Amino acid sequence: ATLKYICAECSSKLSLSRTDAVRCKDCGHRILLKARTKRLVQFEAR
């Protein structure tokens, strides 16, 4: 388990390198979403 990109349609985790084709491995979908930081964001509950 390594977490870089998510698919928009099938929603499968993809984890890709620079120059490795911006497509999804399942449905060959060209629309991808970036992970979300492992960093914990904090908010004032107001």
Partner 1 sequence: EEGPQVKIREASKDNVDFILSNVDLAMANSLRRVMIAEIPTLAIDSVEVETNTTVLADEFIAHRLGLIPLQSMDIEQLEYSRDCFCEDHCDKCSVVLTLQAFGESESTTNVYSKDLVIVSNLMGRNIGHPIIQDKEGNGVLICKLRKGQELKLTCVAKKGIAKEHAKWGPAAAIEFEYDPWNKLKHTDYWYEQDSAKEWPQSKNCEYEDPPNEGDPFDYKAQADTFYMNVESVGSIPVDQVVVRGIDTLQKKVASILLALTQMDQD
Partner 2 sequence: NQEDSMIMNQSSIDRGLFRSLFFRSYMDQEKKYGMSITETFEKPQRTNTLRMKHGTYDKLDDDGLIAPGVRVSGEDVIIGKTTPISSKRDASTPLRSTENGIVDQVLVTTNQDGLKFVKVRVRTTKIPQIGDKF
By residue count, the chain amounts to: 46
Task: Report what 2 binds from Zn ion, partner 2, partner 1, none; CB cut-off 5-8 Å by kind.
Answer: none
Task: Report what 13 binds from Zn ion, partner 2, partner 1, none; CB cut-off 5-8 Å by kind.
Answer: none
Q: Which H/E stretch holds residue 7?
A: strand 5-7
Q: What character string, x for contact with partner 2 (CB under 8 A) and - otherwise, covers 8-37? A: ----------x---xx------xxxxxxxx
Q: Nearer to Zn ion by C-beta: 21 or 27?
A: 27
Contact assessment for residue 45 and residue 23, using Cβ atoms and an 8 Å cutoff: no
Q: How many CB atoms lie within 10 A of CB 8?
A: 12
